[PDB]
C-alpha cells in the first residue's frame, strides 16, 4: 500500500502496480492491482548485432526480427524501434559472441553531417 | 525435576517413578529451549566470515 | 500448468541433467532428488495418515517449476509463459546484479562450465556428508520420540496396583476397581494431553518453515531477488527447487566477485 | 482389526448420499468397493478421469459428487510444452489490469475469565 513491491507474489499475482486496503471484521482485505502480459507473439531474436566489425547490444531492450527486418524493443511490451547508435552500445568485435547476426546500425548524425 | 518436587526425600522419589517419564520429558523440553537461545544469537550476529 | 522441457537439451552449454527428472527411474526423480530420498503404536490407538499429495505428485510440481524456469525465465510466474533462449535469460539476470550483458556473452563458455561444475559438486557433497540433511531428519526423530514416549506411558501404574487394566478387572471387584481405574485414567489422560500440546507447538514451527519455503519459492525460483542473503550468499541469479522427504531443497545460483585489484579513484573529473 | 471411520458427504443442501472410508484397512476385512492406500472406500465410484481435488481422501485420491459420488486421482493442472528454441522469443503485444483480493486475520475476540 505505501509503496510498490518487487517481491514476487507478495502483493498479488503479476507485476505489482499498487494496492488498496479495506477494513473487515477482525481482519483486513487487500485489493491488489497488477499488470499482466496478455497477447504474446513469436519473434526471432539475437544476442547481438554485428556492424562495421563491431558487436552491438541493446541498452534497455531485446533485438527482434519479424522475419525480414531487425528492431529493438522493450521486454514486457512489443514496441519495435529502428536499431541505432542511440539505443545500442558497442563492446568488442563480432568474433566472440555466439549467435551474432549481421544488420545495419543507424547513426542519426550521419545524414545531418 | 526430582529435586524441585521431592527435595532429598527417597520416599517421594520412589513414588515419583510411578508417573513414568514425565520428568525426563520436561528436562528435554527445557534443554531444547536452552540450545535454541544460542542458535538465535549466532543467526543474528555471526553473519560475518 | 505443468510445464515440460524440450526433447533436445540445448541450453547454450548449460547442463541441467542433475536437477531434471531421470526417465530411467520408475519414480521419475532427478539424480539429486533420488539421493536426497535415500538419505532421509498401531495397536494402542495410534495411527498415521497418508499425505494428500504423493511423492510422485510433489516431484511433478518440482519438474514443472524447473521446466518453466529454464524455458521461460521468470515470466511464467507473472502471467503467460514466454519463451526465451537460456543464454539470453542469463544475460538479463546479469543486468539484474549490475553487470553488463556483454560480460555474459563474452564469457559464455566459462560461465556455463563454472555452473556445470558447481552443480556436480552439490551431488558429491550430499553423497559424502551424512549430516547434510540433519534438519529433515530432526523432524522425523522428534515425532518418533514423542510417539514412543506416549506408548511407554501405558506401562506406568500412576499409583494403581497394575498398569494393566485387565489385571485390575479380573482381580478386584467393582467399588474397588473404580478407584484403581480412575488412577490409570487420570495418568493416561494427562499423558495424552501433554502429547497433543507438544504437537501443536511443533506444528507452529513447521508452519513457519513452510511459510518461509513458500516465500523462497516465489522470490528465489519464480524471480530474481534483491534481498541480501535471502536466496544464498552472493548476488542472486536464480534458484532451483528439489523435493525431499517432508521438506524442500533449494539450489541457489549466485554471482561472486573473484579477483579484485587496487585502483586510484575520484568522485568527479 | 480396527480403525477410523470417515464419512464423505456433498452437503445436505445438495444430497443425502454418503461414502464411507475405512481408514488403514483392507476391503476384504470390512464386512462400489475401492481400495486406496488411505483405506477401503465404499459407496464411491472409481473413475479413470482426473479432476481438481474436491474432497481429499489421501494418497492422491479425491472424491466429489457428480448423480453419485465418484473417486479419482487428482489432477495437478493442464500440461504446457513451451516452444523453446535458441533464437525464438515471445513478446506481449498487449496487457490486462487485474485486481485480486487477499484476506488476512488481524485480531481475535478479547475474552476474560473469572
Ligand atoms: C510459437 O511457435 C510455436 C511453434 O514453434 C507454436 O506452437 C506456439 O503456439 C507459437 N506461440 C505463439 C504465441 O504464437
Ligand atoms: C517487418 O517490418 C517491416 C517494417 O514495418 C515491414 O516492411 C516488413 O514487411 C515486415 N516483415 C514481415 C514478414 O512482416
Ligand atoms: C541453434 O540451434 C541450431 C540447431 O537447431 C544450430 O544449427 C544453430 O547454430 C544454433 N544457434 C545458436 C546461436 O546456438
Ligand atoms: C557477417 O558479415 C561478415 C562481413 O562483414 C562476414 O564475413 C560474415 O560471414 C557474415 N556472417 C554471416 C552469418 O553471414
Ligand atoms: C550433462 O552432464 C552429465 C554428467 O556429467 C553428462 O553425462 C552428460 O553427457 C551431459 N550432457 C551433455 C549434453 O553434455
Ligand atoms: C591494496 O593495497 C593494500 C596496501 O595499501 C594492500 O595491503 C592490499 O593487499 C591491496 N589489495 C589488493 C587486492 O591488491
Ligand atoms: C443452498 O442451495 C440453494 C439452492 O437450492 C442455493 O441458492 C444456496 O446458495 C445454497 N447454499 C449454500 C451455502 O451453498
Ligand atoms: C490386502 O491389501 C493388500 C494391498 O494393500 C493386498 O496385497 C493383500 O493381498 C490384501 N489382503 C487380502 C486378504 O485381500
Ligand atoms: C480403468 O482402467 C483400468 C486399466 O488400467 C481398467 O481395468 C478399469 O476397468 C478402468 N475403469 C474404468 C471405470 O474405466
Ligand atoms: C488489448 O486488449 C483489449 C481487450 O482486453 C482490446 O480491447 C485492445 O484493443 C487490445 N489492444 C491492442 C493494441 O490490440
XYZ file of C-alpha atoms and ligand atoms in Angstrom:
685
model
C 0.000 0.000 0.000
C 2.690 2.512 0.991
C 4.921 1.589 -1.936
C 5.422 -0.608 -4.981
C 6.809 -4.063 -4.308
C 9.273 -6.005 -6.435
C 8.784 -9.132 -4.350
C 7.215 -11.860 -6.450
C 3.687 -12.863 -5.464
C 3.880 -10.778 -2.314
C 1.281 -8.243 -3.497
C -0.774 -10.465 -5.795
C -0.067 -12.386 -8.998
C 1.510 -10.416 -11.838
C 3.626 -7.279 -11.740
C 2.570 -5.153 -8.799
C 1.318 -1.661 -9.544
C -0.487 -0.713 -6.336
C -2.827 -1.927 -3.609
C -5.784 -0.650 -1.597
C -6.719 -1.643 1.988
C -10.293 -2.316 3.062
C -11.360 -2.967 6.630
C -13.114 -6.154 7.672
C -14.368 -7.714 10.936
C -11.293 -8.853 12.860
C -9.212 -8.535 9.706
C -8.094 -6.651 6.620
C -8.730 -7.062 2.916
C -6.182 -6.020 0.309
C -7.128 -5.286 -3.267
C -4.029 -5.795 -5.364
C -3.720 -4.153 -8.761
C -1.284 -5.930 -11.054
C -0.074 -5.793 -14.641
C -0.422 -8.975 -16.665
C 1.009 -9.531 -20.196
C -1.816 -10.588 -22.477
C -1.223 -11.289 -26.157
C 2.220 -12.639 -26.944
C 3.728 -13.234 -30.370
C 6.681 -15.301 -31.605
C 9.735 -13.382 -32.875
C 13.225 -14.338 -33.984
C 15.952 -12.974 -31.737
C 19.702 -12.471 -31.421
C 22.105 -11.645 -28.542
C 23.924 -9.018 -30.587
C 24.136 -7.225 -33.924
C 27.349 -7.104 -35.986
C 28.036 -3.857 -37.820
C 31.283 -2.420 -39.169
C 33.151 -5.206 -37.368
C 31.702 -4.165 -34.006
C 29.294 -6.048 -31.737
C 26.225 -4.107 -30.625
C 23.993 -4.854 -27.652
C 20.597 -3.353 -26.631
C 20.749 -0.652 -23.992
C 17.388 -1.457 -22.427
C 15.632 -3.901 -24.742
C 15.950 -7.017 -26.871
C 16.759 -7.475 -30.557
C 13.893 -8.964 -32.526
C 13.125 -9.838 -36.119
C 9.744 -10.042 -37.828
C 11.310 -12.346 -40.452
C 12.731 -9.606 -42.668
C 13.804 -6.648 -40.519
C 15.603 -6.248 -37.203
C 14.312 -3.985 -34.441
C 14.913 -3.355 -30.775
C 12.044 -3.489 -28.293
C 11.353 -3.209 -24.598
C 10.900 -6.609 -22.999
C 7.432 -6.510 -21.443
C 5.635 -4.851 -24.334
C 6.145 -5.105 -28.068
C 7.156 -1.721 -29.402
C 9.705 -2.146 -32.216
C 12.185 0.600 -32.993
C 14.918 1.042 -35.573
C 18.306 -0.113 -34.344
C 20.563 2.902 -33.926
C 23.668 4.020 -32.071
C 21.373 5.691 -29.532
C 19.603 2.549 -28.338
C 22.571 0.190 -28.535
C 26.107 0.063 -27.202
C 29.311 -1.402 -28.573
C 31.560 -3.959 -26.952
C 34.345 -5.797 -28.778
C 34.364 -7.363 -32.242
C 31.975 -9.900 -33.824
C 34.182 -12.965 -33.316
C 33.366 -13.774 -29.692
C 29.587 -13.644 -29.339
C 27.641 -16.746 -30.348
C 24.537 -16.103 -32.433
C 25.511 -12.597 -33.511
C 23.738 -11.519 -36.694
C 24.623 -9.067 -39.488
C 22.450 -5.924 -39.597
C 22.690 -2.177 -40.151
C 23.070 0.116 -37.156
C 21.978 3.650 -37.952
C 23.854 6.753 -36.835
C 21.380 9.710 -36.602
C 24.145 12.244 -37.206
C 25.286 10.594 -40.410
C 22.650 12.281 -42.712
C 22.999 15.527 -40.761
C 26.753 15.549 -41.474
C 12.525 -32.237 38.271
C 13.220 -34.663 41.094
C 14.749 -32.026 43.353
C 12.000 -29.480 42.738
C 9.297 -31.997 43.593
C 10.912 -34.305 46.179
C 13.937 -32.477 47.529
C 16.111 -35.144 49.152
C 13.290 -37.488 50.159
C 13.702 -41.071 48.981
C 10.093 -41.872 49.831
C 8.904 -39.159 47.424
C 11.377 -40.146 44.715
C 10.136 -43.729 44.802
C 6.556 -42.537 44.347
C 7.532 -40.171 41.552
C 8.799 -43.113 39.494
C 5.205 -44.320 39.202
C 4.493 -41.384 36.918
C 6.869 -42.637 34.247
C 8.887 -40.298 32.054
C 7.158 -37.011 32.852
C 10.347 -35.623 34.456
C 12.515 -36.685 31.535
C 10.143 -35.040 29.072
C 10.238 -31.747 30.943
C 14.023 -31.783 31.183
C 14.263 -32.431 27.455
C 11.882 -29.592 26.622
C 13.859 -27.056 28.641
C 17.128 -28.269 27.157
C 15.786 -27.747 23.647
C 14.947 -24.162 24.549
C 18.389 -23.537 26.010
C 20.065 -24.712 22.812
C 17.830 -22.528 20.666
C 18.876 -19.435 22.603
C 22.460 -19.844 21.425
C 21.319 -20.525 17.888
C 19.302 -17.308 17.950
C 22.328 -15.244 18.906
C 24.513 -16.810 16.225
C 21.928 -16.271 13.499
C 21.822 -12.549 14.230
C 25.438 -11.659 14.975
C 27.627 -14.330 13.385
C 26.926 -13.231 9.820
C 30.469 -12.202 9.038
C 33.184 -14.571 7.838
C 0.184 -25.536 -15.533
C 2.558 -28.462 -15.753
C 5.410 -27.340 -17.963
C 7.677 -29.750 -19.803
C 11.234 -29.348 -21.064
C 12.140 -29.707 -24.773
C 13.217 -33.120 -26.207
C 16.585 -31.594 -27.079
C 18.512 -30.186 -24.145
C 20.397 -27.406 -25.919
C 20.779 -24.550 -23.483
C 23.974 -22.985 -24.782
C 26.345 -25.182 -22.775
C 24.292 -25.231 -19.587
C 23.721 -28.775 -18.289
C 20.699 -29.382 -16.020
C 20.849 -33.183 -16.074
C 21.320 -33.405 -12.307
C 18.194 -31.427 -11.464
C 15.898 -32.608 -14.254
C 13.848 -35.861 -13.960
C 15.662 -39.065 -14.839
C 13.339 -41.135 -17.104
C 15.251 -44.340 -16.358
C 13.954 -44.250 -12.788
C 10.405 -45.549 -12.047
C 9.841 -42.646 -9.645
C 10.980 -40.127 -12.267
C 13.104 -38.214 -9.767
C 16.178 -36.182 -10.614
C 19.652 -37.598 -9.758
C 19.834 -35.174 -6.820
C 16.305 -35.844 -5.591
C 16.932 -39.576 -5.652
C 19.973 -39.114 -3.436
C 18.005 -36.954 -1.005
C 15.265 -39.558 -0.664
C 17.741 -42.324 0.116
C 19.345 -40.221 2.848
C 16.042 -39.311 4.569
C 1.962 -47.781 18.229
C -0.820 -49.087 15.950
C -2.302 -51.463 18.494
C -2.705 -48.772 21.134
C -4.984 -46.486 19.142
C -2.151 -44.592 17.466
C -2.269 -44.313 13.694
C -0.634 -42.472 10.817
C -2.496 -40.943 7.905
C -1.079 -40.593 4.356
C -0.354 -37.180 2.749
C -2.805 -35.916 0.148
C -0.015 -35.336 -2.351
C 2.225 -38.268 -3.157
C 5.981 -38.102 -3.628
C 5.380 -38.529 -7.342
C 2.968 -35.603 -7.388
C 5.445 -33.443 -5.496
C 8.165 -34.414 -7.954
C 5.846 -33.430 -10.812
C 5.301 -29.982 -9.331
C 9.047 -29.587 -8.956
C 9.610 -30.609 -12.566
C 7.052 -28.069 -13.747
C 8.804 -25.310 -11.824
C 12.180 -26.256 -13.275
C 10.816 -26.514 -16.801
C 9.265 -23.067 -16.502
C 12.422 -21.511 -15.079
C 14.602 -22.931 -17.830
C 12.429 -22.219 -20.867
C 10.608 -19.017 -19.900
C 12.675 -17.448 -17.134
C 10.527 -15.599 -14.612
C 7.677 -14.810 -16.974
C 5.622 -17.884 -16.138
C 5.331 -16.673 -12.566
C 3.717 -13.344 -13.509
C 1.419 -14.390 -16.337
C 1.787 -16.402 -19.577
C 4.998 -18.369 -20.009
C 7.086 -16.651 -22.665
C 9.999 -18.494 -24.220
C 13.496 -17.037 -24.270
C 16.922 -18.573 -25.130
C 18.601 -19.624 -21.918
C 21.856 -17.608 -22.560
C 19.682 -14.522 -23.027
C 17.903 -15.244 -19.775
C 21.262 -15.358 -18.039
C 22.147 -12.047 -19.663
C 19.021 -10.497 -18.157
C 19.928 -11.891 -14.753
C 23.417 -10.396 -15.064
C 21.898 -6.970 -15.655
C 19.830 -7.579 -12.530
C 23.015 -7.614 -10.439
C 24.623 -4.564 -12.029
C 26.780 -6.415 -14.560
C 26.516 -5.580 -18.244
C 25.124 -8.224 -20.588
C 28.207 -8.292 -22.781
C 30.046 -9.880 -19.868
C 27.759 -12.897 -20.113
C 28.101 -13.336 -23.862
C 31.861 -12.855 -23.925
C 32.359 -15.383 -21.135
C 29.519 -17.732 -22.028
C 31.649 -20.871 -22.193
C 33.416 -20.123 -18.930
C 30.172 -19.310 -17.153
C 28.459 -22.446 -18.427
C 31.414 -24.535 -17.270
C 31.530 -22.910 -13.841
C 27.816 -23.594 -13.492
C 28.071 -27.219 -14.600
C 30.909 -27.961 -12.199
C 29.160 -26.277 -9.282
C 26.098 -28.482 -9.752
C 28.264 -31.601 -9.862
C 29.859 -30.570 -6.571
C 26.437 -30.481 -4.917
C 25.739 -34.084 -5.858
C 29.078 -35.189 -4.417
C 28.801 -33.043 -1.301
C 25.474 -34.568 -0.320
C 26.629 -38.096 -1.150
C 29.632 -37.783 1.157
C 28.013 -35.814 4.004
C 25.758 -37.901 6.357
C 24.708 -34.812 8.334
C 23.713 -32.733 5.310
C 20.018 -33.491 5.770
C 20.014 -33.359 9.562
C 17.324 -30.665 9.573
C 14.819 -33.006 7.943
C 15.937 -35.989 9.993
C 15.453 -33.975 13.178
C 11.763 -33.563 12.389
C 11.389 -37.292 11.857
C 13.273 -38.100 15.048
C 11.293 -35.656 17.178
C 7.967 -37.070 16.076
C 9.122 -40.644 16.605
C 10.375 -39.726 20.065
C 7.002 -38.277 21.012
C 5.059 -41.364 19.945
C 7.460 -43.750 21.641
C 7.122 -41.781 24.852
C 3.338 -41.796 24.604
C 3.247 -45.577 24.226
C 5.707 -46.223 27.046
C 3.468 -44.266 29.419
C 0.990 -47.133 29.106
C 3.410 -49.127 31.246
C 3.077 -46.709 34.160
C 0.968 -47.588 37.197
C 0.254 -43.997 38.209
C -0.419 -45.302 41.718
C -2.568 -48.230 40.599
C -1.842 -51.849 41.508
C -1.084 -52.590 37.862
C -0.537 -50.774 34.585
C -2.727 -53.430 33.008
C -6.433 -52.693 33.143
C -7.373 -56.322 32.583
C -5.472 -57.313 35.722
C -7.490 -54.884 37.792
C -10.836 -56.009 36.408
C -10.102 -59.730 36.748
C -8.810 -59.474 40.343
C -10.576 -56.543 42.095
C -14.402 -56.062 42.382
C -16.471 -53.021 41.133
C -16.331 -50.478 44.056
C -12.522 -51.056 44.427
C -11.885 -51.312 40.659
C -13.277 -47.768 40.107
C -10.545 -46.463 42.393
C -7.674 -48.227 40.656
C -9.024 -47.462 37.202
C -9.535 -43.787 37.900
C -5.832 -43.556 38.730
C -4.931 -45.029 35.343
C -7.397 -42.798 33.522
C -6.007 -39.677 35.143
C -2.417 -40.547 34.275
C -3.184 -41.694 30.747
C -5.347 -38.668 30.050
C -2.581 -36.379 31.306
C -0.036 -38.154 29.116
C -2.206 -37.710 26.052
C -2.837 -34.025 26.759
C 0.907 -33.493 27.084
C 1.468 -35.127 23.707
C -1.143 -33.015 21.955
C 0.122 -29.747 23.416
C 3.651 -30.515 22.243
C 2.378 -31.342 18.757
C 0.573 -28.013 18.496
C 3.734 -26.131 19.392
C 5.837 -28.155 16.955
C 3.195 -27.706 14.278
C 3.584 -23.951 14.603
C 7.315 -24.200 13.988
C 6.793 -26.305 10.874
C 4.149 -23.909 9.593
C 6.593 -21.029 9.916
C 9.184 -23.040 7.995
C 6.643 -23.879 5.299
C 5.714 -20.194 5.019
C 9.365 -19.336 4.528
C 9.797 -22.094 1.961
C 6.765 -20.799 0.089
C 8.238 -17.295 0.108
C 11.560 -18.564 -1.214
C 9.766 -20.487 -3.918
C 8.095 -17.273 -5.055
C 11.057 -14.928 -4.725
C 14.071 -17.167 -5.477
C 12.615 -19.575 -8.026
C 9.871 -17.551 -9.728
C 12.004 -14.418 -9.900
C 15.322 -12.783 -9.081
C 15.678 -11.454 -5.558
C 17.460 -8.294 -4.461
C 17.097 -9.219 -0.804
C 20.506 -9.808 0.730
C 21.231 -13.382 1.788
C 17.640 -14.391 1.163
C 18.490 -16.627 -1.813
C 22.024 -17.643 -0.855
C 25.298 -15.782 -0.336
C 26.412 -13.500 -3.162
C 24.368 -11.764 -5.835
C 21.351 -13.882 -6.671
C 20.999 -15.063 -10.248
C 18.473 -17.889 -9.954
C 17.405 -20.906 -7.919
C 16.150 -24.444 -8.490
C 13.796 -26.438 -6.211
C 14.330 -30.109 -5.421
C 11.897 -32.246 -3.470
C 12.867 -34.014 -0.268
C 11.120 -36.161 2.377
C 8.919 -33.821 4.411
C 10.797 -30.844 3.002
C 12.306 -28.906 0.123
C 15.845 -28.252 -1.035
C 16.812 -25.066 -2.849
C 19.884 -24.827 -5.024
C 20.855 -21.182 -5.179
C 22.995 -19.885 -8.020
C 24.862 -16.708 -7.144
C 27.471 -14.394 -8.622
C 30.593 -13.825 -6.556
C 33.359 -11.272 -7.363
C 36.666 -13.102 -7.517
C 39.894 -11.278 -8.313
C 39.972 -7.681 -7.150
C 42.639 -5.087 -7.874
C 43.549 -1.752 -6.269
C 42.854 1.404 -8.313
C 43.032 5.123 -7.635
C 39.664 6.850 -7.782
C 37.954 10.239 -7.844
C 34.368 11.491 -7.270
C 34.459 13.690 -10.359
C 36.519 14.865 -13.320
C -8.643 -55.374 13.198
C -9.803 -51.830 13.937
C -9.515 -48.300 12.586
C -11.183 -44.944 11.992
C -14.381 -44.477 10.015
C -14.735 -41.344 7.953
C -17.896 -40.259 6.183
C -17.656 -38.404 2.887
C -20.599 -36.143 2.130
C -21.529 -33.474 -0.502
C -23.547 -31.421 1.967
C -27.218 -31.709 2.962
C -28.065 -28.648 0.809
C -27.256 -30.951 -2.152
C -27.771 -34.619 -1.264
C -28.153 -37.263 1.447
C -25.795 -39.722 -0.248
C -22.599 -40.636 1.569
C -19.481 -42.744 1.114
C -17.508 -44.389 3.896
C -13.750 -44.689 4.229
C -12.398 -47.415 6.478
C -9.022 -45.999 7.286
C -5.948 -48.177 7.040
C -7.734 -51.457 6.318
C -8.345 -53.982 3.558
C -11.722 -54.075 1.795
C -11.683 -57.806 2.492
C -11.792 -57.049 6.210
C -14.611 -54.505 6.117
C -17.631 -56.976 6.318
C -18.735 -49.699 -5.218
C -15.762 -51.008 -3.212
C -12.435 -49.352 -3.985
C -9.116 -49.995 -2.260
C -6.912 -46.953 -1.710
C -3.709 -46.513 0.263
C -5.789 -44.499 2.716
C -8.091 -47.453 3.386
C -11.206 -49.023 1.836
C -13.626 -46.588 0.226
C -17.207 -47.797 -0.092
C -20.078 -46.069 -1.863
C -17.876 -44.186 -4.308
C -17.454 -44.986 -7.986
C -13.876 -45.071 -9.171
C -13.271 -43.318 -12.472
C -10.220 -43.211 -14.769
C -10.631 -39.469 -15.385
C -8.918 -36.789 -13.340
C -10.260 -33.592 -11.843
C -9.355 -30.838 -9.421
C -9.476 -32.129 -5.839
C -12.831 -31.577 -4.150
C -12.967 -33.699 -1.011
C -9.499 -35.103 -0.183
C -9.269 -38.802 0.623
C -5.498 -39.204 0.714
C -2.597 -40.649 -1.266
C -3.568 -38.733 -4.398
C -7.247 -39.707 -4.257
C -10.126 -37.202 -4.044
C -13.903 -37.605 -4.135
C -16.756 -35.486 -5.466
C -20.472 -35.553 -6.224
C -21.195 -35.926 -9.955
C -25.959 -38.403 -9.620
C -23.430 -40.243 -7.420
C -20.160 -39.932 -5.510
C -17.005 -40.633 -7.505
C -13.374 -41.264 -6.609
C -10.477 -40.184 -8.798
C -6.785 -39.415 -8.872
C -6.414 -35.666 -8.534
C -5.055 -33.552 -11.369
C -2.132 -31.205 -10.823
C -3.124 -28.960 -13.726
C -3.074 -28.819 -17.529
C 0.115 -29.627 -19.426
C 2.011 -26.958 -21.354
C 5.062 -27.569 -23.516
C 6.839 -24.259 -24.065
C 8.144 -23.659 -27.584
C 11.793 -23.368 -26.627
C 14.496 -22.711 -29.195
C 17.876 -20.949 -29.201
C 16.634 -17.989 -31.289
C 12.939 -17.567 -30.508
C 11.381 -15.103 -28.109
C 7.782 -14.425 -27.137
C 6.850 -10.802 -26.536
C 3.499 -9.406 -25.250
C 1.723 -7.033 -27.604
C -0.967 -6.204 -25.020
C -1.797 -6.374 -21.296
C -4.614 -6.566 -18.792
C -5.177 -4.820 -15.484
C -6.048 -7.385 -12.857
C -7.471 -6.840 -9.408
C -7.271 -9.623 -6.859
C -8.285 -9.922 -3.231
C -6.142 -11.025 -0.308
C -7.704 -11.581 3.104
C -5.866 -11.679 6.436
C -6.966 -12.030 10.101
C -5.699 -9.243 12.337
C -7.243 -9.883 15.733
C -9.445 -12.165 17.788
C -12.092 -11.630 20.457
C -10.703 -10.318 23.741
C -12.088 -12.707 26.322
C -11.582 -12.797 30.069
C -12.353 -15.310 32.779
C -13.116 -15.028 36.460
C 5.205 -20.082 -31.292
O 5.593 -21.148 -32.186
C 5.297 -22.491 -31.714
C 5.831 -23.469 -32.738
O 7.253 -23.490 -32.728
C 3.777 -22.634 -31.524
O 3.458 -23.936 -31.046
C 3.328 -21.579 -30.499
O 1.915 -21.687 -30.290
C 3.662 -20.164 -31.017
N 3.314 -19.216 -29.954
C 2.679 -18.089 -30.235
C 2.321 -17.141 -29.134
O 2.377 -17.817 -31.401
C 8.774 -6.300 -40.975
O 8.608 -4.891 -40.698
C 8.860 -4.052 -41.867
C 8.778 -2.598 -41.452
O 7.495 -2.273 -40.933
C 7.842 -4.396 -42.971
O 8.075 -3.594 -44.122
C 8.007 -5.881 -43.339
O 7.054 -6.236 -44.348
C 7.771 -6.743 -42.091
N 8.051 -8.141 -42.425
C 7.126 -9.073 -42.257
C 7.424 -10.501 -42.598
O 6.011 -8.767 -41.818
C 20.709 -23.008 -32.754
O 20.412 -24.404 -32.975
C 20.657 -24.831 -34.350
C 20.256 -26.286 -34.469
O 18.866 -26.458 -34.227
C 22.142 -24.626 -34.703
O 22.379 -25.003 -36.055
C 22.493 -23.140 -34.524
O 23.875 -22.928 -34.826
C 22.217 -22.738 -33.065
N 22.476 -21.304 -32.898
C 22.898 -20.844 -31.728
C 23.157 -19.384 -31.534
O 23.085 -21.627 -30.788
C 28.637 -11.150 -41.487
O 29.386 -10.210 -42.284
C 30.814 -10.506 -42.348
C 31.489 -9.411 -43.146
O 31.289 -8.141 -42.542
C 31.026 -11.889 -42.992
O 32.412 -12.204 -43.026
C 30.287 -12.940 -42.146
O 30.447 -14.234 -42.738
C 28.790 -12.583 -42.090
N 28.117 -13.536 -41.203
C 27.114 -14.272 -41.656
C 26.427 -15.248 -40.748
O 26.741 -14.159 -42.830
C 25.410 -33.416 -18.788
O 26.190 -33.850 -17.655
C 26.223 -35.296 -17.475
C 27.007 -35.600 -16.215
O 28.345 -35.129 -16.308
C 26.858 -35.953 -18.710
O 26.873 -37.366 -18.560
C 26.015 -35.579 -19.938
O 26.595 -36.162 -21.112
C 25.988 -34.049 -20.095
N 25.095 -33.717 -21.207
C 25.555 -33.045 -22.252
C 24.642 -32.709 -23.392
O 26.739 -32.695 -22.291
C 45.690 -2.905 -1.885
O 46.753 -2.168 -1.244
C 46.988 -2.507 0.150
C 48.078 -1.595 0.671
O 47.609 -0.259 0.796
C 47.384 -3.989 0.248
O 47.604 -4.354 1.606
C 46.234 -4.826 -0.335
O 46.565 -6.217 -0.254
C 45.997 -4.442 -1.811
N 44.823 -5.188 -2.275
C 44.821 -5.773 -3.462
C 43.618 -6.541 -3.911
O 45.808 -5.691 -4.201
C -28.124 -23.974 -0.906
O -28.863 -24.280 -2.112
C -29.546 -23.114 -2.680
C -30.323 -23.560 -3.902
O -31.271 -24.568 -3.572
C -28.518 -22.027 -3.050
O -29.186 -20.877 -3.555
C -27.728 -21.640 -1.788
O -26.743 -20.651 -2.114
C -27.035 -22.899 -1.234
N -26.318 -22.546 -0.004
C -25.003 -22.712 0.065
C -24.256 -22.348 1.313
O -24.384 -23.168 -0.905
C -4.895 -56.544 1.484
O -4.479 -55.448 0.642
C -3.130 -55.626 0.112
C -2.800 -54.409 -0.730
O -2.878 -53.215 0.035
C -3.056 -56.917 -0.731
O -1.726 -57.118 -1.190
C -3.475 -58.118 0.140
O -3.447 -59.320 -0.636
C -4.901 -57.864 0.653
N -5.327 -58.968 1.520
C -6.410 -59.670 1.202
C -6.873 -60.798 2.071
O -7.044 -59.391 0.178
C -9.671 -48.044 -15.598
O -8.520 -48.556 -16.310
C -8.164 -49.919 -15.930
C -6.909 -50.311 -16.683
O -5.805 -49.505 -16.294
C -9.338 -50.866 -16.251
O -9.014 -52.195 -15.863
C -10.578 -50.391 -15.471
O -11.691 -51.243 -15.766
C -10.916 -48.948 -15.887
N -12.038 -48.471 -15.071
C -12.895 -47.589 -15.572
C -14.039 -47.090 -14.744
O -12.751 -47.177 -16.731
C -5.743 -5.112 -25.912
O -6.798 -5.933 -25.366
C -8.061 -5.223 -25.201
C -9.047 -6.159 -24.539
O -8.580 -6.566 -23.261
C -8.557 -4.747 -26.580
O -9.789 -4.053 -26.453
C -7.495 -3.804 -27.171
O -7.918 -3.343 -28.458
C -6.170 -4.570 -27.309
N -5.135 -3.642 -27.766
C -4.454 -3.895 -28.873
C -3.394 -2.944 -29.337
O -4.693 -4.917 -29.529
